[PDB]
Design a protein around this ligand. Structure first.
Ligand SMILES: *[C@@H]1O[C@H](CO)[C@@H](O)[C@H](O)[C@H]1NC(C)=O
Ligand SMILES: *[C@@H]1O[C@H](CO)[C@@H](O)[C@H](O)[C@H]1NC(C)=O
Ligand SMILES: [Cu+2]
Ligand code: NA
Length: 225
């Protein structure tokens, strides 16, 4: 329970949205997310940028960063330790502030699932996130084409048998520089669309598979540039 409260993007601090408070008056690079609760339906309409995922209009900011830049997301004191961490991006195809995030083409730039051990006693990316000051650091691909992008962080907590808990947040970026590269169509997915309850990593009971050492992370392959 929680989410991304703030960012450090290419050396600069950015405040995130404050959940449970009204969006009126708030100003952030982050899309509006209203509660600490997970999205439990993998096909939920708002799974791209959480509920309500709304733009802040004139108060909506965007972080300008070079392709190749390091981007860090900071969480609350995150209480869950079992499941993957995933970082996605999507071209807004225009202004991000006016973009419907559920219509975008999402590609994955970083993930860490089961690093070693078994589902129930192993090391997960989410455990690594907690251990690293409740934060996750990865780079925007060096080659990425300049443009307007959403940067999306997602935690999939799978500690409750057969109930996935998706915790997504979105931040608006202006990506500068780069080398004009775009991910091929095979890396691109929709949100919702990418996930379902037939995915082995989504509809999972870890407690009936306590010697299992494989975990196929849901969603597409990672596009590193
Ligand atoms: C730990 O994260 C907090 C934000 O939650 C940040 O203010 C602080 O600088 C971080 N500390 C270190 C040592 O990275
Ligand atoms: C682990 O491996 C088996 C095949 O050996 C596969 O059927 C199963 O879905 C995998 N589980 C996950 C969570 O990826
Ligand atoms: Cu929780
Ligand atoms: Na904008």
């Amino acid at each position: 329970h929680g989410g991304v409260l703030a960012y450090s993007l290419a050396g600069t601090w950015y405040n995130g949205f404050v959940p449970y408070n009204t969006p009126t008056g708030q100003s952030t690079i982050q899309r509006e997310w209203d509660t600490y609760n997970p999205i439990t339906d993998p096909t939920d309409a708002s799974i791209s940028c959480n509920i309500n995922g709304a733009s802040l209009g004139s108060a909506q900011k965007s972080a300008t960063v070079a392709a190749g830049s390091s981007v860090t997301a900071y969480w609350n004191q995150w209480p869950h330790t079992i499941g993957p961490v995933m970082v996605y991006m999507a071209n807004c195809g225009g202004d991000c502030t006016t973009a419907t995030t559920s219509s975008l083409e999402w590609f994955k730039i970083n993930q860490v699932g089961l690093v070693s051990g078994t589902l129930t006693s192993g090391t997960w990316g989410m455990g690594q996130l907690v251990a690293n000051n409740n934060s996750w650091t990865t780079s925007i691909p060096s080659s990425l084409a300049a443009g307007n992008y959403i940067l999306r962080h997602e935690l999939l907590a799978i500690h409750t048998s057969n109930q996935p808990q998706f915790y997504p947040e979105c931040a608006q970026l202006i990506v500068t520089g780069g080398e004009g590269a775009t991910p091929p169509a095979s890396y691109l997915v929709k949100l919702p669309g990418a996930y379902s309850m037939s995915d082995p990593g989504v509809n999972i009971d870890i407690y009936s598979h306590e010697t299992e050492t494989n975990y196929t992370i849901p969603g597409p392959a990672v596009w590193q540039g």
